[PDB]
A paper describes a structure:
The tetrameric transcription factors p53, p63, and p73 evolved from a common ancestor and play key roles in tumor suppression and development. Surprisingly, p63 and p73 require a second helix in their tetramerization domain for the formation of stable tetramers that is absent in human p53, raising questions about the evolutionary processes leading to diversification. Here we determined the crystal structure of the zebrafish p53 tetramerization domain, which contains a second helix, reminiscent of p63 and p73, combined with p53-like features. Crystallographic studies on the zebrafish p53 tetramerization domain then confirmed the presence of the p63/p73 signature helix in p53 proteins of a subgroup of bony fishes, providing evidence that the last common ancestor of p53, p63, and p73 also had an extended domain with an additional helix that was subsequently lost in many modern-day p53 proteins as a result of divergent evolution.
Size-exclusion chromatography multiangle static light scattering (SEC-MALS) showed that residues 302–345 form stable tetramers. We then determined the X-ray structure of this domain in two different crystal forms at 1.97 Å and 2.2 Å resolution. Crystal form I belongs to space group C2221 and contains six chains in the asymmetric unit: one tetramer and one dimer that forms the same type of tetramer upon applying the crystallographic symmetry. Overall, the zebrafish p53 tetramerization domain adopts the canonical tetramer structure of human p53, which is composed of a dimer of primary dimers with approximate D2 symmetry, but importantly, it has an additional helix that engages in subunit contacts, reminiscent of p63 and p73. Individual subunits within the tetramer adopt a z-shaped conformation, consisting of a short β strand followed by two α helices (H1 and H2). The sharp turn between the β strand and helix H1 is facilitated by a strictly conserved glycine (Gly311), whereas the turn between the two helices is stabilized by a proline (Pro332) at the N-terminal cap of helix H2, which is strictly conserved in p63 and p73. Key intersubunit contacts in the canonical region are conserved, most notably the salt bridge between Arg314 (Arg337 in human) and Asp329 (Asp352 in human) that stabilizes the primary dimer. Depending on the mobility of the C termini within the crystal lattice, we were able to build the model of helix H2 starting at Pro332 up to Met344. This helix reaches across the adjacent primary dimer within the tetramer, resulting in antiparallel packing of two H2 helices. Tyr339 plays a key role in stabilizing the H2-mediated subunit interface. The H2 helix is tilted by approximately 50° relative to the orientation found in p73, with the conserved proline at the N-terminal cap acting as a hinge.
Numbering used by the authors:
A (entry chain D): 302 to 342
B (entry chain C): 302 to 340
C (entry chain E): 303 to 343
D (entry chain F): 302 to 339
């Protein structure tokens, strides 16, 4: 999945919230083994 | 000021980011002097 | 109840501290006060 | 490289910030090369 639109005022909050949102989405698709491997280097 | 929108997957995630948004806004409009006192 | 969050690196620390400081502020500003401050927008 | 600590009030807030931390650490190490791959 259900998809919501978050309204954000200004570039500063937008950039912070996009960064968080994009990070959370990345963690939903990178496999646990791949994630650990990236974290080692 | 410009309004941006973000597509958020999942209700729980939406509620966390909206809460951060609202708290970030508040922190941007409370002067530091007022904030230290409230703290 | 108070928890300690361990953070690696100054850039992640500054982002997380900003979020945490902001949440704490939203806790101690009364609702009517908060409303009057939001007018600026 | 520096290690930092943050005092968080309340377990649900701790859970939120911990997840953001863990996510952000992954985002910092996944290269651009592999971006379309996920
Ligand atoms: Zn600001």
């Amino acid at each position: 999945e259900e998809i919501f639109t978050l309204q954000v005022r200004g570039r500063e909050r937008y950039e912070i919230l996009k960064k968080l949102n994009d990070s959370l989405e990345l963690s939903d698709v990178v496999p646990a083994s791949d994630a650990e491997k990236y974290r080692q280097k």
